[PDB]
Design a protein around this nucleic acid. Structure first.
Ligand code: MG
Ligand code: MG
Ligand code: MG
Ligand code: MG
Ligand code: MG
Ligand code: MG
Ligand code: MG
Ligand code: MG
Ligand code: MG
Ligand code: MG
Ligand code: MG
Ligand code: MG
Ligand code: MG
Ligand code: MG
Ligand code: MG
Ligand code: MG
Ligand code: MG
Ligand code: MG
Ligand code: MG
Ligand code: MG
Ligand code: MG
Ligand code: MG
Ligand code: MG
Ligand code: MG
Ligand code: MG
Ligand code: MG
Ligand code: MG
Ligand code: MG
Ligand code: MG
Ligand code: MG
Ligand code: MG
Ligand code: MG
Ligand code: MG
Ligand code: MG
Ligand code: MG
Ligand code: MG
Ligand code: MG
Ligand code: MG
Ligand code: MG
Ligand code: MG
Ligand code: MG
Ligand code: MG
Ligand code: MG
Ligand code: MG
Ligand code: MG
Ligand code: MG
Ligand code: MG
Ligand code: MG
Ligand code: MG
Ligand code: MG
Ligand code: MG
Ligand code: MG
Ligand code: MG
Ligand code: MG
Ligand code: MG
Ligand code: MG
Ligand code: MG
Ligand code: MG
Ligand code: ZN
Ligand code: ZN
Lengths: 114, 50, 248, 91
RNA sequence: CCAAGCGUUGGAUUGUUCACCCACUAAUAGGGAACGUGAGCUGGGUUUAGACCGUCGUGAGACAGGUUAGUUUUACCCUAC
RNA sequence: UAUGACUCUCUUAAGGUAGCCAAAUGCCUCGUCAUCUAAUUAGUGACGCGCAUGAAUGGAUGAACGAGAUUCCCACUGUCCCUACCUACUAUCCAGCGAAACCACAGCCAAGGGAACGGGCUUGGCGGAAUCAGCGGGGAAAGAAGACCCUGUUGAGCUUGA
RNA sequence: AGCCGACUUAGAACUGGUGCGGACCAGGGGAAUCCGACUGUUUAAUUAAAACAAAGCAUCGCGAAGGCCCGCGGCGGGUGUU
RNA sequence: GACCGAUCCCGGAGAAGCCGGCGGGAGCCCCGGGGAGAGUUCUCUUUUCUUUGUGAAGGGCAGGGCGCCCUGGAAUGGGUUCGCCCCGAGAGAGGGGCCCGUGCCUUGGAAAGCGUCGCGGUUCCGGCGGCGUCCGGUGAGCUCUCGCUGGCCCUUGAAAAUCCGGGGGAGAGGGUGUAAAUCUCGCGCCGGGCCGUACCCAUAUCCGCAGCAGGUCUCCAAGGUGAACAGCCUCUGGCAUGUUGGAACAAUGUAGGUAAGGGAAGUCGGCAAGCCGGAUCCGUAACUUCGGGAUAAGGAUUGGCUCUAAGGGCUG
RNA sequence: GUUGAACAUGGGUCAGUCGGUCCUGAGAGAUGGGCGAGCGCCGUUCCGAAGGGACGGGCGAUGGCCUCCGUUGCCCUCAGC
RNA sequence: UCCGUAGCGGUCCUGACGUGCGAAUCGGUCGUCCGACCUGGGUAUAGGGGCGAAAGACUAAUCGAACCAUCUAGUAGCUGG
């Protein structure tokens, strides 16, 4: 059993000093310093606890590297809001705008007789 | 430590260069009184301040 | 002698408030044309817990009437407020729970919270958890309104200052007994360094005017005059009576 | 089977803090940890998050309520008084 | 009376000296030696600083009034043995 | 026989109520009685006349808990009767290396006198090189210009009706 | 029906000079009294306690030009993002 | 595989506590074989020991997760976990979609590395060669990591640099072509300046006047016994007994033990020492705040060997 | 002691990717202002005319296939922190 | 919450040592060990001031008022020369 040491001067087990084991072409076990796990974007609606789909979960400065199709979904509010709260906002925007027309019609209906 | 700064390393460099014995030919001089180097420093004994 | 513990609190630097994880100053929306002549509508996004405070806070989002921006304010959450609820503000706003309006509009007997003691100072009165104030009477001439503060003392305020309708959420908090010293430690660690209170009779006479003696005793009347110097004004300050409360 | 005869939640406290204090905190520690029905979705998933904060697991609706109960009788009567005063003012 | 040659104990209680009791015995006599004996011991008491009670004092504090916890150093020099 | 509910009198703002006790609090005191022992100034339970108990200067009680204080019993044992034996490292001797404390001069006693307890003085007893391992009687042994007590027209910490 | 594998538990017989948790690891127990509820803390270098703290209980002041406190001084500062 | 668009606005990532349980993937350990080289061989042992692989980055596929979608409408309620939990606000049952893929394969990459055998350079050699680097099985195992779910709080467990997505549509570009504006797509070109980098990191490189039994923050963590990161023995690695050796074995010490008979008579005082101790089976009082007391107290058993019974997956 | 962390001669630390460098935390700390005999102190958004920027246009000049971009000078416009 | 390891601490032997390994250590025995837990680094509070779960504890081996320099060769009816 080969006990192994750190390869950098940081000797404390902090969040950035996280390692994993790796087997080497020289038949020995080394530390490989891992990257932090990324997170998919949370929806802009604010109610859905799940994270968005179709977008890769990377660190924020990795998004400079990635192309646009890896960062969004081909939809209105795509890659920023979930499809459920997109369609539930389409319905809301249509229906309140319709009800405003109903209120405008019922205003003139009262003003016609009075 | 191994995490030195430039000014500390330069100060240590000078104090390393002053820690050599006197050359042999200086006490063949006419107006000479120096027998040896009395300003010498050992790393274990005198801890240089800092 | 030595400077006493109650004297040392005014200098600060140890006894300062622990405000690292607090969410911000909880206050009402600033008064403008909309909230002075009509009403403005906002939405409750979420209800958050403020450390060192039994009351919860509500993050209410309005839209600016002069700029294309969304404005964020931290109200103190009236009990019954949920998210997705529209909170209205101003003179012409209707009378519902979680709906701030000036006290001269609401009728007598209205239960309010986050009351303003002066017009426009964004809420100062009756804003601890479970507390409220009651509107007693108005006075249309000279624009004055009498309110009953949660200490029972009645105050005459201006008729133009604002208060959100309802009681503060998180009531009954002092009903649950703190069972152990650990919960009190965790309570006051979120507020300030004041909790492990040593009695003055357990100290030395250099440390407190009550310390010293071969018996743990005060040795002097603990009732003290109001105009006493600091380092002496301990015990029961300016006390009108000091006994078990019988009657009223 | 039935584990304890008269202590419920407060059996975790053992033989400490006093019987009357445990009997006092038993009501709070039941009502604080009970899951209430939701007034918005109907599911029994309204659980306390902190003091004054009650979150629904299904609807994701959080409500400002009491410290140890979802509703307080000191505020239900206030809700009734405010709706009757609202009807009184507008007549 | 001559007489100090030889003995004069084991324990419960109390830090005790003293005292008191049980038992054995032949007798359970009295004392001194810096009130023998702490570089021989021990530290129960007394006699620092921490605390509690009673009394006294306005108080800090006081009490041959109780209670509890509280560092016991060195000989290899000279003499004596 | 005693104690004595009851009464009278003197009195202060009342005159210690419920409880509790020779208590961590009781001088007398090792209080009296019971129990525990062969024997108990200890322990426990009662009695209360309490020098000087007592109700948030908190009173009484009380499960669990305690490197807290105390008494007794079972079991256990070198704590003891009453000491003995063995092992390791020392101490011992040797090769090498090698200090310090302390030191008026120094060092055998009895008695006398004396600054009222001598190593030296007086009178006696007597005394013999250089040393080794132990030892704790003496050097009124060493350390530290007594912390107790008193004085100083020396102070500091603290308190108050200076 | 065939092929594979992981540690356990219970029972029985035999057997040793009754020895077997064979080294190691590893709670003495009971009846009571006083005090402190407890967990925690404390005089670093003589006192770990019955002392301190503690939750609970109860008083006191204060509605902000305020209560308590700091500061040589300011339209100064802490509690107070109350 | 790209897939115009500014001032402005919205949002996300950075950016989150402690604990419990479960699942997946590595590394290490374990078992059964093939090689290669060693060890024993007085007798036995197809025996014992060592070793037996692949980086970053890219592509593909397992595997894990989804609080993602479509059909359809469920009570004789079902699905389902270790626990939970989910459902007419749509369960089961079919069909898809996304994320992470540190696992496997491939490019790297066998050319290099390692084991073993043998030739050279008389040697100064990243010297040249012959073979091999293989096939499986398992686990409440230990460590790390990923994920799911739950519990606790009068405790709710950081900010900013920096980066991205979206909504809007001011504008820009070309008149049917050697098309234009534009591009987060594949390649191609150039550059990345300054400072630190050795060693000790502790019974000898730091601080205690010193190579001082004191103090001083972390990472890795094998086999057996065993509940165990306990104690004891061993492998890799390390060291020479802690500022000296030899010879003696006196007292008194210091650190360990053992003692007939008695059992606290010792002592201020059971101080010190001693008894008890793990696990299995029964059994367990007064009192109580009903939670405890409680391993109360009390006994019985425990070795070795030979067996039996019971407790599971895979395929048809 | 033929040995050493002793002495005397000589050598030895190589980076776009490992860290510092950048950000903010608790906090420290100028200016405006206030106070102060004074060195100075307070105070960190509070008694402040606190932005030296950008796109589009107009004007002006420069330099190169003076074609078409780039450059700076002025004005209009817009701007939070 | 209990036994108990690492860690943190320091009961008893009033053991060792006590011109010591050590100007506070060592051995056995002990308390606690999921929470009022332990700990590094950064930062804040400075001497009649800080800080104190309160011992007059701690504030660089110094604490019932730290340390350094100066006033200062402070004064002494007292001690020694
Ligand atoms: Mg870092
Ligand atoms: Mg690999
Ligand atoms: Mg995509
Ligand atoms: Mg050194
Ligand atoms: Mg604290
Ligand atoms: Mg005190
Ligand atoms: Mg005073
Ligand atoms: Mg008095
Ligand atoms: Mg004597
Ligand atoms: Mg003597
Ligand atoms: Mg002595
Ligand atoms: Mg004593
Ligand atoms: Mg004392
Ligand atoms: Mg000798
Ligand atoms: Mg009475
Ligand atoms: Mg006795
Ligand atoms: Mg009694
Ligand atoms: Mg009294
Ligand atoms: Mg009293
Ligand atoms: Mg010698
Ligand atoms: Mg003499
Ligand atoms: Mg002579
Ligand atoms: Mg002597
Ligand atoms: Mg002496
Ligand atoms: Mg003197
Ligand atoms: Mg005089
Ligand atoms: Mg004086
Ligand atoms: Mg002074
Ligand atoms: Mg006066
Ligand atoms: Mg009693
Ligand atoms: Mg206690
Ligand atoms: Mg001490
Ligand atoms: Mg101690
Ligand atoms: Mg389904
Ligand atoms: Mg090869
Ligand atoms: Mg668009
Ligand atoms: Mg290095
Ligand atoms: Mg050494
Ligand atoms: Mg040895
Ligand atoms: Mg040796
Ligand atoms: Mg014996
Ligand atoms: Mg025997
Ligand atoms: Mg005895
Ligand atoms: Mg005796
Ligand atoms: Mg003992
Ligand atoms: Mg018991
Ligand atoms: Mg070397
Ligand atoms: Mg390179
Ligand atoms: Mg400043
Ligand atoms: Mg615990
Ligand atoms: Mg424990
Ligand atoms: Mg000792
Ligand atoms: Mg000695
Ligand atoms: Mg030594
Ligand atoms: Mg100050
Ligand atoms: Mg403390
Ligand atoms: Mg004192
Ligand atoms: Mg005089
Ligand atoms: Zn959504
Ligand atoms: Zn709901």
């Amino acid at each position: 059993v080969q006990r192994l040491t750190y390869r950098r001067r940081l000797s404390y087990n902090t969040a950035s000093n996280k390692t994993r084991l790796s087997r080497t072409p020289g038949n020995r076990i080394v530390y490989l310093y891992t990257k932090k796990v990324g997170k998919a974007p949370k929806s802009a609606c604010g109610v859905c606890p799940g994270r968005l789909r179709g977008v890769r979960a990377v660190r924020p400065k990795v998004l400079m590297r990635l192309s646009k199709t890896k960062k969004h979904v081909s939809r209105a509010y795509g890659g920023s809001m979930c499809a459920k709260c997109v369609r539930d906002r389409i319905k809301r925007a249509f229906l309140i705008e319709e009800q405003k027309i109903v209120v405008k019609v019922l205003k003139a209906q009262a003003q016609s007789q009075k | 430590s191994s995490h030195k700064t430039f000014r500390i390393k330069r100060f240590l460099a000078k104090k390393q260069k002053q820690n050599r014995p006197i050359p042999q030919w200086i006490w063949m001089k006419t107006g000479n009184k120096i027998r040896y180097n009395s300003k010498r420093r050992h790393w274990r004994r005198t801890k240089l301040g800092l | 002698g030595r400077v006493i513990r109650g004297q040392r609190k005014g200098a600060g630097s140890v006894f300062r408030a622990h405000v690292k994880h607090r969410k911000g100053a909880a206050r009402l929306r600033a008064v403008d044309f909309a909230e002075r002549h009509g009403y403005i509508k906002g939405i409750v996004k979420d209800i958050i817990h403020d450390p060192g405070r039994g009351a919860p806070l509500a993050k209410v989002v309005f839209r600016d009437p002069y700029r294309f921006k969304k404005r964020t304010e931290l109200f103190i959450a009236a009990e019954g407020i949920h998210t997705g609820q529209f909170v209205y503000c101003g003179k012409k706003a209707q009378l519902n729970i979680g709906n701030v309006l000036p006290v001269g509009t609401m009728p007598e007997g209205t239960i309010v919270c986050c009351l303003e003691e002066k017009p426009g100072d964004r809420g100062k009165l009756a804003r601890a958890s479970g507390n409220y104030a009651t509107v007693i009477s108005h006075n249309p001439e000279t624009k004055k309104t009498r309110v009953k503060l949660p200490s029972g003392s009645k105050k005459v305020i201006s008729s133009a200052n604002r208060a959100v309708v309802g009681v503060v959420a998180g009531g009954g908090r002092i009903d649950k007994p703190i069972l152990k010293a650990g919960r009190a430690y965790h309570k006051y660690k979120a507020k300030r360094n004041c909790w492990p209170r040593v009695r003055g009779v357990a100290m030395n006479p250099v440390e407190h005017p009550f310390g010293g003696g071969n018996h743990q005793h005060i040795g002097k009347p603990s009732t003290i005059r109001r105009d006493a110097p600091a380092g002496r004004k301990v015990g029961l300050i300016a006390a009108r009576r000091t006994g078990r409360l019988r009657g009223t | 089977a039935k584990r304890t005869k008269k202590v419920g939640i407060v059996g975790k406290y053992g033989t400490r803090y006093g019987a009357s204090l445990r009997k006092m905190v038993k009501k709070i520690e039941i009502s604080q940890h009970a899951k209430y029905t939701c007034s918005f979705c109907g599911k029994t998933k309204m659980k306390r998050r902190a003091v004054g904060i009650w979150h629904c697991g299904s609807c994701m609706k959080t409500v400002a309520g009491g410290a140890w109960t979802y509703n307080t009788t000191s505020a239900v009567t206030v809700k009734s008084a405010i709706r009757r005063l609202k009807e009184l003012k507008d007549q």
